A paper describes a structure:
Here we report a previously unknown budding yeast polarisome protein encoded by YFR016C, named actin-interacting protein 5 (Aip5). Aip5 is found to accelerate the formation of actin filaments in vitro through its C-terminal folded-domain (Aip5-C) and mediates actin cable assembly in cells. Structural studies by X-ray crystallography and biochemical assays have identified that Aip5-C is in a dimeric form, in which the dimer state and a loop region that directly binds to G-actin play essential roles in regulating actin assembly activity. Here we report a polarisome protein Aip5 that aids in actin assembly in vitro and promotes formin Bni1-mediated actin nucleation directly through the interactions toward G-actin and the C-terminus of Bni1.
Therefore, we designed several constructs containing the C-terminal region and identified that one version spanning residues 1110–1233 (referred to as Aip5-C) displayed high solubility. The crystals obtained diffraction beyond 2.0 Å. The structure of Aip5-C was determined by the selenomethionine-multiple wavelength anomalous diffraction (SeMet-MAD) phasing method. The crystalized Aip5-C forms a homodimer, in which protomers A and B consist of four β-sheets in the core region flanked by four α-helices. This structural arrangement can be subdivided into an N-terminal β1α1β2 motif and a C-terminal β3β4α3α4 motif, representing a typical thioredoxin fold. Interactions within the dimer interface are predominantly hydrogen bonds that are formed by water molecules (3, 5, 10, 18, 20, 101) and two β2 strands to stabilize the dimer. Interestingly, superposition of Aip5-C with cGrx2 revealed that the substrate glutathione disulfide-binding site (CxxC motif) of cGrx2 is replaced by a hydrophobic loop (SLAGGGFH) connecting β1 and α1 in Aip5-C. Superposition of protomers A and B showed a root mean square deviation (RMSD) value of 1.5 Å, which indicates high similarity between the two protomers, except for the lack of clear electron density for the loop region between β1 and α1 in protomer B. The loops located in the region of protomers A and B in the Aip5-C dimer run almost parallel with the heads of α1s pointing toward each other. Structural study guided our identification of an Aip5-C loop that directly interacts with G-actin, which is necessary for Aip5 actin assembly activities.
Numbering used by the authors:
A (entry chain B): 1142 to 1151, 1157 to 1231
B (entry chain A): 1135 to 1230
Amino acid sequence: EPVYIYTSLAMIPRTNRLSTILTANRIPFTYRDLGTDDEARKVWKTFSKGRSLPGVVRGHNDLIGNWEEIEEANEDYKLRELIYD
Amino acid sequence: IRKLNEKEPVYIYTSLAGGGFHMIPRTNRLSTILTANRIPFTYRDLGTDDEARKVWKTFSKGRSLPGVVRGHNDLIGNWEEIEEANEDYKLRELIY
């Protein structure tokens, strides 16, 4: 399943940190800009439960976590949380 | 398999970490033009998007980024070609 970093390009530098963490864990990703991407907007609004952007989404609508949660999985180094939910 | 009975998606191919000459201002200008013609789009970042990178390398003919692409690989035009066209665009994306 493809992995995305949900963002708002017009969110904050935190996107760059997220990108660095995924690359470090050899996780390929592409960006999704909620400023222009209605699918991403729908997914983030439905599932974020008020969590702030940015974040990581797998496939069409599997919200893995926002930046803070991704940070947390990374210091536990279980960021490959996102392939097993 | 792919979904039927819908419009081909439209992309602005760009490089979000810049580098390319006037990459961000030209991207911003492209965005304004597409929005002006009421054309929905998403960005493709060639820095992280390998297929978008491959598409541009194959079809750009040396044209500089950013540009507009329809579907998987229908390069409509780069920023300059798109700039000139700003008479009717809808015709070049939807009628072609």
